[PDB]
Amino acid sequence: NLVPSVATV
Amino acid sequence: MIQRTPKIQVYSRHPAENGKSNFLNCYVSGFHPSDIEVDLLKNGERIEKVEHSDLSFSKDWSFYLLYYTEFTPTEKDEYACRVNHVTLSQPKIVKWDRDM
Amino acid sequence: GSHSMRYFFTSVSRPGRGEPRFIAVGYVDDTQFVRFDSDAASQRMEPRAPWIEQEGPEYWDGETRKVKAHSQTHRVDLGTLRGYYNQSEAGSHTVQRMYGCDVGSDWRFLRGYHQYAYDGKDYIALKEDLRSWTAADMAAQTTKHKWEAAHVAEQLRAYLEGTCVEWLRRYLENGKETLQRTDAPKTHMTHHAVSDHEATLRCWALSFYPAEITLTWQRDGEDQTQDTELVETRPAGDGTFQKWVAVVVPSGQEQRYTCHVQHEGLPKPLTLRW
To answer: Listed disulfide bonds for this chain (chain B)?
Structure first.
């Protein structure tokens, strides 16, 4: 189950 | 950029016996960048039906792939893996050694 | 023993036309269970272990949505990072991301991680406490400040200690028949001669799972490292792993040398002799 959100660098 | 040259192992999935179907493997690892060319050779000739694993990497960020094909060994057939990568001036050929 | 769930993601930019190549893979321990490849036809998250096929259409829709969100962040990141490092549009570049959680033998949270690399070098990583960041350079430091203001670490810590662990336990249960099985290595020894003075002894371990293994040689009951060669552990292709270790010895002295194999599928270490 993947992380819900991925912040941009 | 960083550039790391691939290590190569060529080997079968199961212990190798003539007349007995098996899988020829070429495992390439420790390389960067990700683009790489890998062929399996039967008697010097490129095998067409070759599959590879999905690209993944080690903790040091270097990539690894398994290329593989179904084959039936015989006494006289010679097998190899030919690899080309940015870090290589000439393709590298490693022979399958079944006596190892 | 202990277990892990880990996701690995690679994006590679393609200068002349279109979006980057994006590949995502998910593992439980040393078993891959899912994949997405941006070059594949389905544009869906795909099963790679039979026990994940138990999961319903909502799982596949939700994992697909998230993995495409992962893809778009990576696409944005490649342009942002090109900017940070004053690079041109001509060259191809890479971002790699790994995250996941470890649980112990009790299946409780042990460790979480989230690390990120640009062109194969450390960029930024979550620290062990999951409350702070390790930024390798000033570009990464700009990202750290961005992520601190946005409380990114807090959102990750909740996932890594919560959902990650919960779903690992779930996968471990659904995949019990393989994921909780150990396969002990099948061992043998080969012998070759280079000349009439010198011999090569090779100790093989085949067909084992998980990947972790120790193979060593001893000479007369003491560890021998000189004149030995130990290969990288390698996938057999059927889910199991292989490794060997060789030693060069004087012909006739083969009996002094013993191979020792440690693996979680063996209650005690095993010894081999020629």
So the answer is: 26-81
